[PDB]
Design a protein around this ligand. Structure first.
Ligand SMILES: Nc1ncnc2c1ncn2[C@@H]1O[C@H](C[C@@H](N)CC[C@H](N)C(=O)O)[C@@H](O)[C@H]1O
Length: 256
């Protein structure tokens, strides 16, 4: 039994009250007040449609992924990763696909900087999409479940699905459950072939062990996974630490 599995078991024991306090304890979060108010008013400029724009920006501004040319955004949701990439100098085209429909977010149309180079498509299950040529491959798919074996199956499926899209390009792929031994085996094989490294984003909630496989980096996958498991385990030991608050991103306005 891995450290991650011990973390999961403890998470599933928490009451809703304990869970809600644990999930943001000591994390970093952007202040969404202004964006939520603007989006409720139907404002289409400046606001990021979700917390996702700030989350991908954290990797981008650390050069862990450097979006360029044709960007494919798998599981785009409302479009936060897509609208963020739309304003980056090196990006020329953004194609987002998302499931939508009941239980899934629909793309939100925006007029933030570079909106005219974005195409978001709903009603698209990426597990049936044939791969397309692209310069940047992003994937943020991985639905949490109280069952780690269900999460293991979901994580492996994402990893098998993204590989044919990987052709010496920039990438940032969510790994929902990176601690299960079978997932580790796939991550190690994929890293030997495609390089990159698994990174924990400080904007992720403690209620998920998610890590991101990013193209520009090296390191030991097992060590990075066990470091996260120990961090999350130590976060149950103390009383709620209020999250570190940062400014949300301003995605501006205008065509390009
Ligand atoms: N099989 C699937 N094919 C397509 N989209 C999917 C599938 N499974 C889940 N999704 C979507 O993937 C999205 C994942 C989100 N974490 C994306 C948030 C996005 N990165 C943002 O910044 O707004 C959700 O909107 C799901 O509805």
């Amino acid at each position: 039994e891995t450290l991650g599995e011990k973390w999961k078991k403890k998470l599933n024991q928490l009451s809703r009250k304990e869970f809600d306090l644990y999930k943001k304890s000591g994390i970093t979060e952007v202040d969404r007040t202004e964006a939520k108010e603007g989006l409720k008013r139907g404002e289409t400029t400046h606001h990021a449609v979700s917390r996702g724009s700030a989350k991908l920006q954290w990797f981008v501004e650390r050069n862990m992924v450097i979006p360029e040319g044709r960007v494919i955004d798998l599981g785009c949701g409302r479009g936060g990763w897509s609208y963020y990439c739309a304003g980056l100098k090196k990006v020329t085209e953004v194609r987002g696909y998302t499931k939508g429909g009941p239980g899934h977010e629909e793309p939100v149309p925006m007029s933030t900087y570079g909106w005219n180079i974005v195409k978001l498509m709903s009603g698209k299950d990426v597990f049936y999409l044939p791969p397309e040529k692209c310069d940047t491959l992003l994937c943020d798919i991985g639905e949490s479940s109280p069952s780690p074996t269900v999460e293991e199956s979901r994580t492996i499926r994402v990893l098998k699905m993204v590989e044919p899209w990987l052709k010496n390009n920039q990438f940032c792929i969510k790994v929902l459950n990176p601690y299960m031994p079978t997932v580790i085996e796939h991550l190690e094989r994929l890293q030997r072939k495609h390089g990159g490294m698994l990174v924990r984003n400080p904007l992720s909630r403690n209620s998920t062990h998610e890590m991101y496989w990013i193209s520009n980096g090296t390191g030991n996958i097992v060590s990075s996974v066990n470091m996260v498991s120990r961090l999350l385990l130590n976060r149950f030991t103390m009383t709620h630490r209020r999250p570190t608050i940062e400014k949300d991103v301003d995605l501006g306005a205008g065509t390009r």
